[PDB]
Each structure stands twice: as structure tokens, then as C-alpha cells.
Amino acid sequence: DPRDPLLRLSNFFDDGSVELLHERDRSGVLAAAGTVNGVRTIAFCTDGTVMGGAMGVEGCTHIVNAYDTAIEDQSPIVGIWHSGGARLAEGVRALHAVGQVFEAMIRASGYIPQISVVVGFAAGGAAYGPALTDVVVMAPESRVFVTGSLGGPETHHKKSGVCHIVADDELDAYDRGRRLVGLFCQQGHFDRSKAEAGDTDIHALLPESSRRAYDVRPIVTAILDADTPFDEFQANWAPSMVVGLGRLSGRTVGVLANNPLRLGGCLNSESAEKAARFVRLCDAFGIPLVVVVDVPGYLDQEWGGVVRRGAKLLHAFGECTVPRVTLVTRKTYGGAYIAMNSRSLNATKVFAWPDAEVAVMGAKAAVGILHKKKLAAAPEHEREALHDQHERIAGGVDSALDIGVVDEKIDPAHTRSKLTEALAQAPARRGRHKN
Amino acid sequence: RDPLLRLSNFFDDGSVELLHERDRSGVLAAAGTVNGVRTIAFCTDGTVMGGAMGVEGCTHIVNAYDTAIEDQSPIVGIWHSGGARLAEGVRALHAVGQVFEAMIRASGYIPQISVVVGFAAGGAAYGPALTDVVVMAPESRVFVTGPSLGGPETHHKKSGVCHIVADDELDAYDRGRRLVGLFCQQGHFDRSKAEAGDTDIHALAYDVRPIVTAILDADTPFDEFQANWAPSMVVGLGRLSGRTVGVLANNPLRLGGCLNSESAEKAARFVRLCDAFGIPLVVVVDVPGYLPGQEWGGVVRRGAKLLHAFGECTVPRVTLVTRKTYGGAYIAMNSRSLNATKVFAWPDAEVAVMGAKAAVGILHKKKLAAAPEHEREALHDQLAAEHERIAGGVDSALDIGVVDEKIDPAHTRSKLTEALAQAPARR
Secondary structure (H helix, E strand, C coil): CCCCHHHHHHHHCCCCCCCCCCCCCCCCEECCCCEECCEECEEEEECCCCHHHCECHHHHHHHHHHHHHHHHCCCCEEEECCECCECCCCCCHHHHHHHHHHHHHHHHECCECCEECCCCCECCHHHHHHHCCCEEEECCCCCCCCCCCCCCCCCHHHHHCCCCEECCCHHHHHHHHHHHHHHCCCCCCCCHHHHHHHCCCHHHHCCCCCCCCCCHHHHHHHHCCCCCCCCCCCCCCCCCCEEEEEECCCCEEEEEECCCCCHHHCECHHHHHHHHHHHHHHHCCCCCEEEEECCCCECCCCCCCHHHHHHHHHHHHHHCCCCEEEEECCCCCHHHHCCCCCHHHCCCEEEECCCCCCCCCCCCCCCCCCCCCCCCCCCCCCCCCCCCCCCCCCCCCHHHHCCCCCCCCCCHHHHHHHHHHHHCCCCCCCCCCCC | CCHHHHHHCCCCCCCCEECCCCCCCCCECEEEEECCEEEECCECCCCHHHHCCCHHHHHHHHHHHHHHHHHCCCEEEECCCCCCCCCCCHHHHHHHHHHHHHHHCCCCCCCEEECCCCCCCCHHHHHHHHCCEECCCCCCCCCCCCCCCCCCCHHHCCCCCCCCCCCCHHHHHHHHHHCHHHHCCCCCCCCCCCCCCCCCCCCCCCCCHHHHHHHCCCCCCCEEECCCCCCCEEEEEEEECCEEEEEEEECCECECCCCCHHHHHHHHHHHHHHHCCCCCEEEEECCCCCCCCCCCCHHHHCCHHHHHHHHCCCCCEEEEECCEECHHHHHHCCCHHHCCCCEEECCCCEECCCCCCCCCCCCCCCCCCCCCHHHHHHHCCCCHHHHHHHCCCCCHHHHCCCCCEECCCCCCHHHHHHHHHCCCCCC
């Protein structure tokens, strides 16, 4: 019973806003219409009461048919899933039908938003169905068994990064996917005198010694208003990188944080494809980003990936064209400085904190190449000179600022203020996707 | 290590034409030819501080790029570097990001081959990463480091950052030269440089590698990429009637010719590459499904990119099915679903989702629960005969339109040549 297409669409749509494309084609899916918090959205849920939900010819039809609506009406499209993959009896006709939907999504990839919202079953093509989409909000009772196990969002929030969002309950998946279509579509404009009310000294949320770890998620809370955002995609994945979407003086912004709590904020292969996909997202949807840099470097020692698996994040920033402001609070080193929306990748503006050092090796201590033939093997007795124990008399801002690659130094009380100011001064832009 | 000769040791004997005076930053950028093709190049000076990447150098590679893109010419990099001048600081470090910045404005437009010969750390280990084909010389250890660690044999396995491993530096120059003869000398299909070529091939688990070889020219080499990394999948360029051709085939040997988190990726970029260079393709199916990695996690989100690549694919892409092909993967391996050109087949090749034995499993549910045990395991081998026909029989998926027409084992090359030919070049 509760797996009813209309009962469900009725749960996502604000009640009396619903329409209906295809017949009550009791085939597997229902493709209704209507708005989300006001803004119109083509959708499609699947009937999990009618033959497993396994996607068939007839059922796929309205699905694809619904694409070319939302695609023609440049309105967003959403899919509350619940399918045991393809209908084994239909032969290939279904396989074909299962496969036209894929390409139905792929054509929308960045033209309209494509939230998927999986409530339960999700296998085979329906396991790849929402892969192609843009944001996967998994329902706490949704599983994934496509063997050609165990099931759950708890396994994808971590490990696989497959599921973008775990929901408090299936009903929240309706409530969650409903804001992502608002943020993707009611980003609105900026507001100069609205962050002014919330100019917290953000440097307060920073450790004492630039050596003592912390968690950047709390810092984030400050830059974003109080309502009520994050809405950060798989926190449990790429733990040294906390990406996430959200509003700022009304206007919606992508946020990519380098969380030093885990791995010391250090980037890596698995840490890139989080960002690397998250940037081109807010890029291909005209959403400003913010970069909160505090990363030492990048790495057991899997070279099995890295170089390629880290090139793409540069490619994410270097090809991106949305308004994007960077800021460094402490760290920013080497080929990782470069990789964090720096000027060499065409940043909008780049900001920094009082002790926001910027070097290719660090500073305490990063001299063991310059001072190579000295600070060496006389005793190891008293390593307080040392090398170990330049730094303060360089690195910070001006050491990179007169060079221009950093644009300013700022009072963190009005950290929020600055970005918003810097972000409001670029033009709206949006790109494509592929080659 | 000396840049000049080393650049004269790549170009056509001629031909090298310095796009500046020879300084000491650690870069030498010069124009020239390869089989008569306007080619721009650049090489890091292995001598000067280990080929390090600094400001006035990167600048030159930049101006190489601006000139490659200006003139619509491919762009090669020769790399005996190893990072970015540790004592030029942010300038150098920013000098590199500029080079990416160029290189990033290079994907999908002009060709870009990296032919590493010396060390490579940081930006030097990252330049290659933004260049389409990565050709790694023996001694050329991309000996990259964090904050062996990987030679050419090593960076062809589990990583596979390189594409064509060499066996000597100069030959690697014969690699990278011929390698532009494919992108910028694609050629045009010849209708009769196809005929005297198609064997009755079908007459042969197994190994797929030697099938691809018979599809392409008998003469022209099979420049396979990636091989040892992601092996259950096969990719690599060649020719057909003179027209350059891309090829990707399942690999009955490892992993049961199936898809896996690595597999789909290797094919994935490979396609996006070709549709970004007008080159047409050939896809010889034999995937019997997917596989995790036990990451059942990656393979889903990571499998998607096969769907995309073909979805977003506007170059010709004719498919050949060899025997079995199944589910998402079957759809994945260049199906009509993803706007395919045409699909041909061979007299003994089935298109289904799982197939007999499987195509009766769990469906009949009341089977291994309500049947005589001393026959269940044997009557499990029974439901396959009616199946094979009523399930998976290809004279099904003929009418259904997904496999255009069945082609004879003799008349194979002509076909994979014909359909690619009569097709449009764009859209």
C-alpha cells in the first residue's frame, strides 16, 4: 500500500499542485507534474505494488516521455525510485526500454537538475538509473543489491560515496529532495546588508598552534546563514574534504571544505572526485562556490590512481566558469595550493587569515633543501635549531600577495561579509558538461 | 638530457624551429614536423636543476600552447623534469598552474601526447595527467612522491597512468610520432582496402586480444593503451582502410570478460577521447555481466560513465557481438539504447540479461523448494534448452531492432568498415 505512485508523488508535491502525464498505466511508474515550494517540476515515482516495480517497456515510456517535458520546459526533473531492476520476462524490449531512460537522463545532465530520490529497492538499471543523475538522497530503508549486499545508505555515505544523502526517514527524502530543487532553482540574488548581522569572528573557531588539528565543519556553520544548510554531500566520504551546498545572503552557494580532522585535510584520489564532481555541479548549474583552504599536501601509499585521480580536480576548477571565491585560513601547499581554486586556475578572488602561510613545502620546517648541506648529521642532539624547531618571516600573504596570487588580507569577524561582497561582484555564468 | 638534440631527435629530420632563444629556466619550446604534420612541441631541460619547472620556463610552455591552439596543431611534451623550482616559490608554483590552465583549455580540441623520458614530480608528474595519451619511457620513472614508487611497468598496473609502455627512449619518440599520425592523420575509409582482409574469423573461455588485430589492418600496428591496467577490458587505436580507428573489447581471460570498477573507466575515458577527435570506433562484445572491485560500491557510480560516454557520443560507434552479452553491461557496451549507429552480429551470439540457467533462477521460485532434490541440480541444467530458444535466441533481438542484422564470419571486416563509412561524421 504505502508504495503507491500517487500517494508518494502526493507526498513530494505540495498537495493540489499535481498533474498526470500517462494513463494510470499500471505498468511500474507514474509520471505526474506540479510544483515544489512553488516552482514547477516534472517527476516520476515507481509503483512498488505492481510486479516488483521492475522497469518495463510501458513503464519506461512515460519516464522517458517525462524527460522530454522537463527538458522542453527547462523545468527540473525528479525520480523517486523503488525498482528491482529490469523486467526479466520482457526479453530485451525492457532492456532496450531500461536503456533509453539512461540516455534520457544523460541528455539532461546539467541542462535541468536531475535529483533522484530512492526510497527502497534500487538494483540493476535502477542502480545505475540514479547514478547518472546529479544528487542521490537515499531513504534509510533503501538497499542496494545488484550482483552480476547487506543494503543501506550507511554503506554509501561511507566507502562508496554512492549515496549523496542519507535521510532521517523516507518521508524526509521527500522533504530533502524538495530543497535541492529549490536551491537548484531559487538561488535568487545576493544581499549585502544581511550577512552584516552575522559577522562572527570566525578565527575564534580556529585552534591555537598552527599544528593542533580541528574539524572544519563547525567553521562552515559560521559562513552560512542560520537556515539551514548542509546539505553537505557524503560527509562520510573523502573525509579530508567536506563539500556541501547552501545559501549565503539568500543566494545559494556550493561550499568545498578541506576538513583537517581527517587525514589532516590532505587531498588524495578518493578526496578529489568528491570535489571534482561537486565543482562542475555548481558550475553547470550557475552556483557560486567558496573555497576554505587549509590543506598540507596529498598522499597505504596508493599511487594506484592519484596523479590521474587528482588531475581531474584541477580540471574541475580550470574549466569551471561560475563566480568562485577562494580563502586560505592556514595551510595551502604546493600542487595542492594550485588545486584549490587558485589564480592559476582562474579564481574570482583569493583571501587569507593573519597566519595563512603559502609554500611549496611549508615552513616549519620546509628548508631542508635550501639548507641541505648543513642542518644534517652532526649529532641529532638538540633538534631545537634545528632543522625541526623563514616560517614567520615569509609564507604569510605578502609573500604571495605582492606576487598577486592572493588578492587581500581580511578581518575574520567580517569573513562572511567579504566573500559575499567578492562573490556578488562577478557575473552570473553557466557552462555545459562533456568533451 | 640535452633539450635541443632531444627535440631534433623527435621531429622530422628538418624541421625543429625554436620559438625563442635558448635560456636556462628548464624548458625548450620549438616548432617542427612529423610525417609532414605541423607539430608544436616542448621539453624540460633535464640538466638545469633536474628539469625543474619555474616561471620563465612554464611561460614558454604556455606560449607553446597558445601557438598550438592558435594554429590548430597537436602538442607534445617531453619530460625530464621533477617538480617546480623549490626556491622560486609561489611564482614557480603559480607558474605551473598556468601550464595546467593552458592544458585544461586543450582537452577535446587539439591532440596532446606526453612522452616522458626522465623524472617527473608534481606539475611534471601532472602535465602528462592532462595530456590525452601518456607514453612512458623505461628509464622515465614518473617517480612521483607525496608530501618502486612507480616506473613505466609499475604505472601500467593498478594505476595505469601511462597508456603505451615503451622499451627505449628513442623508440618512445617513434611511439609519440606515429601517435600523432593517428589523431592528425586520421585519413578516410577506403571501400576496397577492406575486402582483401576479412577472414572467416568466427571459426575461433578464450582470449579476445587476437580478434581486434584481425579487424584492423593486417599491416598497421595495434597501439593498445592501458593493457595491464584494467585488463578485463581492452582499448587501443589502429587503422581500417587507412582511416584511423578506435577499438574497445571485453576480455575473456581475466575477470570473465566482465565489467568492473576499473574496466568501465578504461573504456570510459577512451571513448570521450575519440568523440573528441572525430575518430570512429569498433566495439566487440562479450561481457557476461558486471563485477564489484569487494566494492559493489564503486562499480555502480563508476559504471555510469560507460553509459555517459556512449550517451554523449557523437562519433560513429559500430558494435560487434561475439556470443554472450548481458544486462546493464550489455546496454553499457555500446547499445542502440545509447543512440548507437548500427549493430551487427555473428551466427552464434546471444543477447539476453542473464541467460538460460539464470533466466530460470529465482523466477520459478517454487523450484529449489518444491522439487525432487536428486534431480533439482540436474533439472537446473534442464530449463536451459527451451530457454536458449524462447530466451536469448537472437532471432528475437533482430526484429526488436537492437541488433540490426546478423553478419557472416567471412564478411566481417567489410561490414565493420561499411557501416562506419556510410555514417555521418558529426551528429
